[PDB]
Amino acid sequence: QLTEEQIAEFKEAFSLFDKDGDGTITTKELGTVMRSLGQNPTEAELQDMINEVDADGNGTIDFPEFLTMMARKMKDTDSEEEIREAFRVFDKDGNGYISAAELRHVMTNLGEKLTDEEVDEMIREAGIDGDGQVNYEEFVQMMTA
């Protein structure tokens, strides 16, 4: 379940980040790619990203570790349960629904802070009911399908 087309793309993507050519991705190089996309990542964020990919612990990302990151499952039963368990945080009475107004507040004003247009699209896909509630199992399913 990995083709020579898939590997060529992942290898070309690996080199957009490895500006050095030394076969290894540094926090500095990752910060340079992010900063050119107009993001302003802190060093703390860059080190967390590198540390979640760096499997052997030498502070850099080689190509095999890059491959593991790109091929790691995101739509599996275990990830499904983590996202579901993340929504239950905001389901105060455990009834499977979050208030659309509470959802948009959390999505725009906590964590990474999505934009209002991003939340519009997000909430339009699950639908709001007559009661202003959002069935959040709809996100868990449509994101892991």
């Binding site: 990203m49 979640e52 995101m74 983590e82 996202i83 993340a86 945080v89 990474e112 999505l114 994101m143």
Partner: protein, 62 residues
């Protein structure tokens, strides 16, 4: 815990929405004037890395 929960949800949704070439999640990169292929490449990678970071912190907090 609430910040870790919100970041897991938001980084998962940014990965999912980035699969749609016409999603409004692409409109936030105002530093790029014309989104090209290598741009959609690196963005998708970054968002993926930010999801695994948030998954890790959510596990610690729950």
């Amino acid at each position: 815990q609430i910040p870790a929960a919100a970041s897991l949800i938001q980084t998962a949704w940014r990965c999912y929405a980035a699969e749609n070439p016409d999603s409004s999640t692409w409109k936030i990169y105002i530093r790029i004037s014309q989104l090209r292929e290598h741009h959609r490449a690196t963005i998708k990678v970054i968002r993926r890395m930010q999801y695994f970071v948030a998954k890790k912190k959510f596990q610690q907090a729950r």
